[PDB]
Structures are given as structure tokens and as C-alpha cells.
Design an enzyme around this catalytic site. Structure first.
Site, PDB file in Angstrom:
ATOM      1  N   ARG A  14       0.838  -1.215   0.000  1.00  0.00           N
ATOM      2  CA  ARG A  14       0.000   0.000   0.000  1.00  0.00           C
ATOM      3  C   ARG A  14       0.852   1.235   0.000  1.00  0.00           C
ATOM      4  NH1 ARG A  14       0.687   1.324   5.340  1.00  0.00           N
ATOM      5  NH2 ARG A  14       1.515  -0.642   6.193  1.00  0.00           N
ATOM      6  N   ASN A  15       2.130   1.117   0.348  1.00  0.00           N
ATOM      7  CA  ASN A  15       2.952   2.338   0.315  1.00  0.00           C
ATOM      8  C   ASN A  15       3.754   2.442  -0.969  1.00  0.00           C
ATOM      9  OD1 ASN A  15       2.382   3.834   2.643  1.00  0.00           O
ATOM     10  ND2 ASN A  15       3.560   2.510   3.985  1.00  0.00           N
TER      11      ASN A  15
END
Ligand SMILES: CCCc1ccc(NC(=O)c2ccccc2NCc2ccc(=O)[nH]c2)cc1C(F)(F)F
Length: 265
Positions: free
Chosen positions: A135-136
Site C-alpha cells: 500500500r505504500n
């Protein structure tokens, strides 16, 4: 500063996301007409030194697969950190919604190698990310991937040890020594890289399928690990497994992981 700029050279548009603290918005740097991403803290999010530390470190980074710092508004509040806008968004949703024939195992492998090269670089710098996960990670044109952080960063360098108040770490990506003794290092970032390799292989499935959070560490400690995903090459799985070595020092460095990708093949 070189980096200092000013708002109203920037139109703030909607949110893109954020983390425990910090929120990132899409915006436009009118002048040069560029769409950009701008991270802000809240009115009463008293985490100034943390925000400043993120901006300061970002000025030291120059790598093709680490999101690009464009500027910062740090002479007065609200403070901003401005980076390039990554046309395809976060890697985790990219993977969950993608055309798999186009985003095939080989593209997944190349994506992994690009992250491993960003990490080896952070590693040379003695910078620890602390929230590495799909997600990053961000996606540009033609499957280009870059490591980034949507949250107010909890990085640590060889000179820093602080973090924002009540910093909580996601159990499924956090190495055992880190959860149990608060011991973070490059090696804990290597543990997280292993889980991210697993996210990439499964097209963004949630880790530790079929296990409750309460058992993750206990099972890890008894030598259980997530299984090789379907279609994931054995050498890629072996690399995941070495990243998941219990003893931090028995995990490979990022320089070795990148080399393994180079010589796989
Ligand atoms: C060891 C250093 C680790 C590190 C910490 C913090 C950041 N900070 C950003 O990633 C960042 C800063 C400011 C604004 C946005 C933003 N990213 C999100 C985004 C979303 C959509 C979008 O389009 N662009 C950016 C990076 C890193 C790094 F890169 F080294 F790993």
C-alpha cells in the site's frame, strides 16, 4: 533551501490517502502546470519535528524507484512535503484491479526487482523505512514501481530514533523482534520486503490467510511461514523465506537480495 516553495503556486485537490498521522492530497503546482502529491499534518497534530525529519531525509534521496521530492513548505505552517504524482496510484490496489495477462509473473518479478533496488539504496544510506508494504508503493506508466509512504513517516536514520506519538506497527508486516522488543533495523525492513514480495505474487491478497492476528507471532516463532504462492518461482519463494529468517542477522541484506534478482536468470 533549494526546496522551499509557497502555497498558491499549488491548488489543493482531493485526498489520495494517509496513515496513522499525515494525509496526502492530489494538487497542482500551477506554474509548471504539474499535478503533484502533497502531504499535510493536521491543525493539532503536534508532530512537527517528525514531519521535518521526513522532509529532511527526502532531500537526501535520489533514486529512480523512490518517489521524487519536488519541494517543501517548511518555513511556516501548514507545512507541506511535495512529491511527483504517480499516475497509477498505490501498488496494492493496482495489483487487485489489474489485467493479469498484461501484469504477468514476469512484470511482478520486474516490479520486485525495482523495489529491491530502491531498498538497497536506502540501505546504503542507513535509512529505515519502517512501513514497507504494497500500500505504500506507487505505480507510474508502464508498470514502473516506486517505494513511498502515505503516512507521516516513522523512518529512522543512523542519527535518529524518534517517532510520532502512539506509532502502531501493522502486525502482518512487522518483524518478530520489532513487535516484541521494539527493535527496528534494515533487517526489519527486509522482513517487511519479504511480505511485500508475497503481496506482489498473490496480486495483493491479505497476508497470513486463514490465521487470526493473535496467532501470527506464535506460529512464526514455531517456524510456520506463509506458503509459496501459486505460480511463484521457487527462487523467488526462497528469497521470501530468507527475508523471514527469525534472527535479523540471518536475513540477507538488500544488496544481496538485489543481486539474487540479478542472477536468478
Ligand atoms: C527512508 C525514507 C522513507 C520515506 C518516507 C516518507 C516518504 N514520503 C512520501 O512518499 C511522500 C511525501 C510527501 C507527499 C507524498 C508522499 N508519498 C505518497 C504519494 C501518493 C500518491 C502520489 O501520487 N505521490 C506520493 C517517502 C519515503 C521513501 F520514498 F524514501 F521511501
Amino acid at each position: 533551501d533549494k526546496w522551499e516553495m509557497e502555497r498558491t503556486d499549488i491548488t489543493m485537490k482531493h485526498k489520495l490517502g494517509g496513515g496513522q498521522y499525515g494525509e496526502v492530497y492530489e494538487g497542482v503546482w500551477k506554474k509548471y502546470s504539474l499535478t503533484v502529491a502533497v502531504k499535510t499534518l493536521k491543525e493539532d497534530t503536534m508532530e512537527v519535528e517528525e514531519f521535518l525529519k521526513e522532509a529532511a531525509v527526502m532531500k537526501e534521496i535520489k533514486h529512480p524507484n523512490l518517489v521524487q521530492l519536488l519541494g517543501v513548505c517548511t518555513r511556516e505552517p501548514p507545512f507541506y512535503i511535495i512529491t511527483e504524482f504517480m499516475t497509477y496510484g498505490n501498488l496494492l490496489d493496482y495489483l487487485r484491479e489489474c489485467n493479469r495477462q498484461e501484469v504477468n509473473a514476469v512484470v511482478l518479478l520486474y516490479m520486485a526487482t525495482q523495489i529491491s533496488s530502491a531498498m538497497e539504496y536506502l540501505e546504503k544510506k542507513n535509512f529505515i523505512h519502517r512501513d514497507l508494504a504494497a500500500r505504500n508503493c506507487l505505480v507510474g506508466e508502464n508498470h514502473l514501481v516506486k517505494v513511498a509512504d502515505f503516512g507521516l513517516s516513522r523512518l529512522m536514520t543512523g542519527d535518529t530514533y524518534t517517532a510520532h506519538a502512539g506509532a502502531k506497527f501493522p502486525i502482518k508486516w512487522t518483524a518478530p523482534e520489532s513487535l516484541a522488543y521494539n527493535k527496528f533495523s534494515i533487517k526489519s525492513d527486509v522482513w517487511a520486503f519479504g511480505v511485500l514480495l508475497w503481496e506482489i505474487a498473490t496480486y495483493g491478497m491479505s497476508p497470513y490467510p486463514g490465521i487470526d492476528l493473535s496467532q501470527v507471532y506464535e506460529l512464526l516463532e514455531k517456524d510456520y511461514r506463509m506458503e509459496r504462492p501459486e505460480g511463484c518461482p521457487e527462487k523467488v519463494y526462497e528469497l521470501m523465506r530468507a527475508c523471514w529468517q527469525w534472527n535479523p542477522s540471518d536475513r540477507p541484506s538488500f544488496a544481496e537480495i538485489h543481486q539474487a534478482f540479478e542472477t536468478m536468470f
